[PDB]
Amino acid sequence: VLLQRISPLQIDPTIISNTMSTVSESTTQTLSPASSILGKLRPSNSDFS
């Protein structure tokens, strides 16, 4: 928390989602690698303590 008071960066999870929304898949397919990335990483949580 003493480092959170000081550190200049701010972790925003929107970067990885806004760059993985760029993928070009064919949708006639059960397997979704980009959605596997998103549902696996789960960027949308807080608390990177």
CB of 4 to other proteins, least distance (A): 7
CB of 31 to other proteins, least distance (A): 8
Residue 10 binding other proteins, by CB under 8 A? yes
**First-to-last C-alpha distance (Å) of the chain:** 8
> Longest Cα pair distance anywhere in the chain, in angstroms?
50
Residue 24 binding other proteins, by CB under 8 A? no
CB of 22 to other proteins, least distance (A): 10
